[model samples]
Target: IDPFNIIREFRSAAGQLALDLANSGDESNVISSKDWELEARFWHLVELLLVFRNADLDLDEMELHPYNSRGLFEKKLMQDNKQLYQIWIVMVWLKENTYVMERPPTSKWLNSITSGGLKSCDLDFPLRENTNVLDVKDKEEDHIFFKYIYELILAGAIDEALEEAKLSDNISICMILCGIQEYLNPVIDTQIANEFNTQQGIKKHSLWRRTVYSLSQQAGLDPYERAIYSYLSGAIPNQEVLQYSDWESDLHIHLNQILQTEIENYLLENNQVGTDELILPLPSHALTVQEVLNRVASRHPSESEHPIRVLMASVILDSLPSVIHSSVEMLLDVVDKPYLLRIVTHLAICLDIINPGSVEEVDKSKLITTYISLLKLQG
Candidate 1:
């Protein structure tokens, strides 16, 4: 595609009216305060006419309801004519490339598209065929581009999506690219359902450790690791791992023990409680200092791995990192003593597992050695 070809194709196609309106308005290329409203409106008309013919409603109306289904129907009609759609998408892309809106149509320009005769059909075009070899190639390119983007969304490689898009939406690929909303519907619903279930669990447990467990469900994010895991998990090409099998026997056995203790503590707290009650508070949580001590003080420091806690640990270990840091930081202040122990202990566990036998190394003048000594002497 030569530069002149682009210029020629553009002038002889959908952009002619837009360029005409833009150039004819204030031909001196000067704007005055008196001309502001008219300027904004006509500029809006230029922008609107390119991609969105007849899509000139006010921002007030846009705020209330964004779509004009008629615009979509018109888009479909143009799509049926590939050459026209190509010219129109490019017309839209350039008119929009300099925009500063958080989203489209910017503001103020929405209410009036009335710089009249904006549609390509109304204007006389050179008598050339719209269905050409170039048209097929262009349509094929958009499909390939659409599939590339849709795969990114599916594999959770969202921000990695091509920035050279003609269109985009926040957390919404539907309005972005060439409309694969129907294909994404199932996956979107799956994650939203998971989010809803997590929301419901927020007030479920009445104590600290269970709360930690809940927070873990939504915490932990490792972008590079997750993408790698997703790629590897797709052992069968073009296939993906949707859900983990419900089969971890020893993990379940240890988990049952944790749950029983949590239940017992909950019962004691509500003994003289629950539906009008009160009783001796058992310990404050399922995994507390006293509980951890009793278990670890047994004969092995590895008791922490009893259940390897957290359902879908592999997955939750890859979500919302800044969120988890903010959460754990807040918890340290709120429940300092117990949560302090939990934090160092949890870090030691994860770090030790992450890099075995490095716990005693001191990049810190044996301040690190003393800490390792403490951990060693404890259990």
Candidate 2:
């Protein structure tokens, strides 16, 4: 029911999506997700690129791959996608906060959840006097401070996070966060300077990430504090990151983890980082998009069969045929759902425009029969 509202909002956003694309042809624009409006646009562009991948036009007997995934969405897409995941993380946090009763979050409350498992472990270590009241109080304070800073960084508010770290009067936090700013800042330079600067930055990032990874392994740190540090260092979260119940957010997490793994391996192979340190074990083999989709689908077996999930999977995997297959499957299941029919017919037509005859499995004329029927009844 909640997703229904979001899906309807997404449907209506399509008009603005087209207008924004048309207006920004071939122009470089700022790409950050500071707000929900821009975040939605960021995702819409991803969908557009996905749809564009299916285009099959010819430039005088030669194939014209304007939307080739390799050309258009490879490197740049990965960078944008990382930011998109960050945006999703922040939004989900805000949504969870919204549904709860309006009240300020307290350090005790933060620790109550963060160290819930630890408290259970206390039962196992009953005679271990290492746990003290003062230590518990410090953990609560640390969790509250670091949790706020983590959320700020996730929202792309790095400067604010730095200020908060400074306000906490913790020199180590401030110093590490400053280095994090350096790693995140974009660098533009000439050919030689570019390589020289990047290598220098990589060296610094390597050391900082190693330290962050070590911090993630510390048993005294809060779970979110550890996860954000791991994430900041281009590693998978060392602990549970967030609570989510949707395909899109889950897909983002998968993308983020996979992308981070790829980057870590790249760094490792090139000697940017070392293995004699705390780090995620190298994946046996990098996961392809289809593999990621299969993993996500396995978690939601029944929902994976739903037409919407199939459409989403088709777009991300750049498999146009699957889209057609799913559309027809929906049609055969029910005839009374005119709104669903309206959506599928229009989607098919749009897909047709990009890649002519992509839906050849079904008669083209019959594709619009639902549209005609809806209009006939209206008149």
Candidate 3:
């Protein structure tokens, strides 16, 4: 059978297996048996199918429930509180395995839930661990939960329905910001203003800066709006100038020329550039290939490299006018080392030199294409 049919079959088998396991409760441990392990692997396959279905494939309500899995899978597969929690854990696993490559949908999903007036949803499901339901009097909580599902489906489109379903209600804007800060190590200098200056620090720091500014703008935050305008007005600097010594002007010109010559010469000497061939040196601190690719593709549909390329181009274009204005007499003296490296590293990773392992190796090119296409709808 084709991949689509394969997915459907596996999903049915997996749902039956899960139902069997769930019903098998309080008896001998289902997990300890070899048969159970085999079934677990099958369930994993089914889970991945669900993930892909949410990400790319479309499914009608009729097709979602198969005869083989009758009464096994619920209509609202992720609606049950316990199942919802389990799905979240599975989603976390998918993320770790790089199965779901798009930026986290937590914020958007949470906003949809809150705006829908589903506060009771929070009562049944506390925003965090250690919290429990105080009272079960509110039937609206159930409505809210189901409504939340609808909102997710509406937001993600039919293809992203599963992804939206997997989202945890606990995730919020503040939580994302906190995670960003932690990831970028924003606390190192303690003094935000000063920390935003150093070469290694500032270049890397700007990713979070830009991300926060963008997300804030999306959320209609005044402070972030002002900050974004301020930063943009000041001409984004080239990251390379900040990161690399003696790199001042025409950073891409120099690098691109070198890359072209090396690749051409290598191709001439060796019949081909093997998949294992190194395209460029990896950066010490680089975003995963999947992350950069997804970001670019999502942001810049017009650009070949997708969202990342678009982001880089915009940054470069914005920085150009300021660089020239800074030194009118010496127009060539334009350089902002920090921004240069940020763009370069992003491109390098996507181009396959920096982190080859970051790219998932799929048997079919169409699968990769489908993955990228799915991520494009994330924004």
Candidate 4:
């Protein structure tokens, strides 16, 4: 019963479960965008915890990023500012990497403007004469390519985004993507695709980021385009740019903004970047983990009690044992006690594995014993 293995399996199972529902969805049983969004949210939560478990196993040996992650019988958790910043880097990267795979394809995605399904927009070399007029219809219809490009950019999948941009023949967007790729991507060669070249582009990073920040603030940009630049710029997106985001995406965006602040602070502190050059302005100080968690709670008061939200905050605050204890106490009175116990007990075991003696002996013994009884009752 390796906890990591359990979580690994559970993560895959969760994804397959969502895929099944999504495939089965129709007018009679609709799996709305909201449903898929929830699925992605849960998957991201599980997957990020799995990575943390791996980090705990070898905390010192691990550098900042470029890290790697099991089965349910069946079934899946960081510290300080610089340390927290590193964790955020890895967490955000994992979110982006998995997101590209997790986001279900849109029903009417347009690859080339000339594709018969969509009208007015043209992939032809010269911009269409009517293309400026196309914006009104595109906004009314909400072209799916906007979603595709936005998702692609969020994932940092510039190659594929470039292909999509080229197909749509949006020269300016394509050119910006090229600049982004050169700055963000370590290598063009697929052989070393896994490498995160954060250090490689440091010299140009400030300048590139400043340019993108301006792009994000520029008016008349499509919401998705603004979102793409805001993300690349590591700026907190405005409402227009967040038009289609779910709760988790919104959370990730703010977390990313905090991370960028930390990163810029690090670069400046170490004299890694030329501070004399114009740079993306940052908050005077990076928001503490607790502050960010509190901000999220304020925005989604109804979700304050959501298990994932609680657990995520616990993990970030390094209060997992307390949260687990509270969770056990909290769920004891619920009608779904047995099922919920199954979750908390395994998590107890997983927590114990991550840091022995962290879980109170009484808590561990009581949870396992109760869980065993429940298993027997089920049998």
Per-candidate RMSD, Å: 28.9, 12.3, 27.1, 9.3
> TM-scores, in order shown?
0.16, 0.54, 0.19, 0.63
Weakest 10 consecutive residues of candidate 4 by summed lDDT = 68-77
Error of 3 at 174 (Å): 2.3
Error of 1 at 217 (Å): 32
Which ranges of candidate 1 are over 4 A from the true structure?
A: 1-136, 151-379
Tell me, by TM-score, which candidate is best: 4
The lDDT values for all models are: 0.29, 0.47, 0.31, 0.51
Candidate 2 has an lDDT of 0.47
Candidate order, lDDT descending: 4, 2, 3, 1
The TM-score between candidate 4 and the true structure equals 0.63
RMSD of 1: 28.9
| Most accurate candidate by lDDT | 4
Worst 10 residues of 1 by lDDT: 179-188
lDDT of 4: 0.51
Candidate 4 lDDT over residue span 72-162, tens digit each: 0000012333455545654564455435532322222233344443354443223333344433443433335556777766665767777
lDDT of 1 at 77: 32
TM-score of 2: 0.54
Off by over 4 Å in 3: 1-7, 33-379
Better of 1 and 3 by lDDT: 3
